[PDB]
Ligand binder design. Structure first.
Ligand SMILES: *[C@@H]1O[C@H](CO)[C@@H](O[C@@H]2O[C@H](CO)[C@@H](O[C@@H]3O[C@H](CO)[C@@H](O)[C@H](O)[C@@H]3O)[C@H](O)[C@H]2NC(C)=O)[C@H](O)[C@H]1NC(C)=O
Ligand SMILES: *[C@@H]1O[C@H](CO)[C@@H](O[C@@H]2O[C@H](CO)[C@@H](O[C@@H]3O[C@H](CO)[C@@H](O)[C@H](O)[C@@H]3O)[C@H](O)[C@H]2NC(C)=O)[C@H](O)[C@H]1NC(C)=O
Ligand SMILES: CCCCCCCCOCCOCCOCCOCCO
Ligand SMILES: CCCCCCCCOCCOCCOCCOCCO
Ligand SMILES: CCCCCCCCOCCOCCOCCOCCO
Ligand SMILES: CCCCCCCCOCCOCCOCCOCCO
Ligand SMILES: CCCCCCCCOCCOCCOCCOCCO
Ligand SMILES: *C/C=C(C)/C=C\C=C(C)\C=C\C1=C(C)CCCC1(C)C
Ligand SMILES: CCCCCCCCCCCC[N+](C)(C)[O-]
Ligand SMILES: [Zn+2]
Length: 328
């Protein structure tokens, strides 16, 4: 056996030397150097100390400024909340797990870490869908005399929560399950075992198809409509050069957010898909540790892209932080 399966775990280390233990029962220092566990800990600590203030700040600045009530403003507020859930719901646990080198909080700890990570990632993915569609509607206005206003914004946000929970929750109640990965200090979906009792196989398929591929199809479609229009379907829409310059700011930003997501999550995606199609194969704990922990920057990069690429949000922020002068 290249790894060590247990009732509820899969250590990617051979147990021929009898050293393997359950990531729920004892430290995993046999897996790698303890200074590496300190690196993860240190890492999570930074993510928490960065993620807590940039998200809250985003959330706070948005609420405080009434003029910040467009679909973008709404979507980014939504991410800010999603990220605070990742930070406080998940990262605190992954931090503490890294410090002890195992899930001292047992499977309940693992569920927290896996849930909020999955939730935050998916909320970001589906939010991208809502934005692309909003860019589509606002930049090409295909449907009739329609208004993607505040009302749809709310419906947009609720929508992201629905899809994301459709992915993150089922493994909490019997469809697949959260399971330790890599050095055993973070938890992901079970790509590792078939465990037919929780119908693992069918969940992983559902996840990759509905919670990765489909959303990418939708965004790709929208991206199609925008390239086309910015080309020859907009010169007939008489888009005044004055609005386009502000609607191109926002369009560029969404595109960057989409690229950042791919940069952040594809590596995890690939390893997961690999493991899934090579169960039992010989891979170490480092194979998934790097992509998994890297993906956790998803809790941080969005508000930063926001601050850096949306002048209106930026100015409001400086205003909030400087009190009065640097508004809404
Ligand atoms: C655990 O990992 C090892 C690799 O580290 C996997 O073992 C590999 O298994 C394949 C078959 O699935 C072996 O291929 C066979 O090679 C012989 C040559 O003697 C050939 O006649 C067969 O037709 C076939 O091609 C491969 O050699 C083997 N690698 C080694 C060196 O062990 C294994 O599948 C993984 N899981 C298990 C079973 O523990
Ligand atoms: C990796 O292999 C090691 C041993 O190579 C596994 O740990 C060992 O597990 C055995 C069987 O559970 C333990 O033996 C116990 O013996 C008493 C006899 O009084 C019996 O009453 C128990 O039911 C049990 O059979 C043994 O203590 C333990 N060895 C130690 C101390 O490490 C280990 O479980 C394997 N990794 C995993 C968790 O898959
Ligand atoms: C709001 C979601 C919080 C998730 C907490 C899950 C903790 C329950 O786990 C206890 C045992 O469940 C293990 C089965 O998987
Ligand atoms: C012009 C029709 C061909 C488009 C097929 C691509 C898939 C579109 O589905 C995405 C939903 O919008
Ligand atoms: C795509 C193949 C897997 C390689 C992982 C990509 C990692 C991105 O490198 C950036 C380094 O930051 C990772 C630090 O997190 C680990 C602690
Ligand atoms: C230098 C990399 C060459 C190895 C490429 C292997 C391609 C095997 O096709 C499998 C299809 O998987 C999708 C993308 O492939 C990337 C790695 O494949 C591993 C499968 O998870
Ligand atoms: C961790 C996030 C760091 C982002 C800092 C951004 C703060 C504002 O930057 C000021 C740069 O000013 C350039 C354009 O701002 C418009 C004001 O003129
Ligand atoms: C640090 C902990 C992590 C990364 C735990 C779990 C992550 C997932 C189950 C991720 C799922 C996916 C997302 C969020 C978006 C890209 C596709 C996906 C299905 C791999
Ligand atoms: C539905 C399939 C999606 C798979 C996405 C794959 C992205 C590639 C990322 C690196 C994976 C390569 N590998 C084998 C080292 O894991
Ligand atoms: Zn409306």
């Amino acid at each position: 056996m290249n790894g060590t399966e247990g009732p509820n775990f899969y250590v990617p280390f051979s147990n021929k030397t009898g050293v393997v233990r359950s990531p729920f029962e004892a430290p995993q220092y046999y897996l790698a150097e303890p200074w590496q566990f300190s690196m993860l800990a240190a890492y999570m600590f930074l993510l928490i100390m960065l993620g807590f203030p940039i998200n809250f700040l985003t959330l706070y600045v948005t609420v405080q400024h009434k003029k910040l009530r467009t679909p973008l403003n709404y979507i980014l507020l939504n991410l800010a909340v999603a990220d605070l859930f990742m930070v406080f719901g998940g990262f605190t646990t992954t931090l503490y797990t890294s410090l002890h080198g195992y899930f001292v909080f047992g499977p309940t700890g693992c569920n927290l870490e896996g849930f909020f990570a999955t939730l935050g990632g998916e909320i970001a993915l589906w939010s991208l869908v809502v934005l692309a569609i909003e860019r589509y509607v606002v930049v090409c206005k295909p449907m009739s005399n329609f208004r993607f206003g505040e009302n749809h914004a709310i419906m947009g946000v609720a929508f992201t929560w629905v899809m994301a929970l459709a992915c993150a929750a089922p493994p909490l109640v019997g469809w697949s399950r959260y399971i330790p990965e890599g050095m055993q200090c973070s938890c992901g979906i079970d790509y590792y075992t078939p465990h037919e009792e929780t119908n693992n196989e069918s969940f992983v398929i559902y996840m990759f198809v509905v919670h990765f591929i489909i959303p990418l199809i939708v965004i790709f479609f929208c991206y199609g409509q925008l390239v086309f229009t910015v080309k020859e379907a907009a010169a007939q829409q008489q888009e005044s050069a004055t609005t386009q310059k502000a609607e191109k700011e926002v369009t560029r930003m969404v595109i960057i957010m989409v690229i950042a997501f791919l940069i952040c999550w594809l590596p995890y995606a690939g390893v997961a898909f690999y493991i899934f199609t090579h169960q039992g194969s010989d891979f170490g704990p480092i194979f998934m540790t790097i992509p998994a922990f890297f993906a956790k920057t998803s809790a941080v990069y969005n508000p930063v892209i926001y601050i850096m690429m949306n002048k209106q949000f930026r100015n409001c922020m400086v205003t909030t932080l400087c009190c009065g002068k640097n508004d809404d």
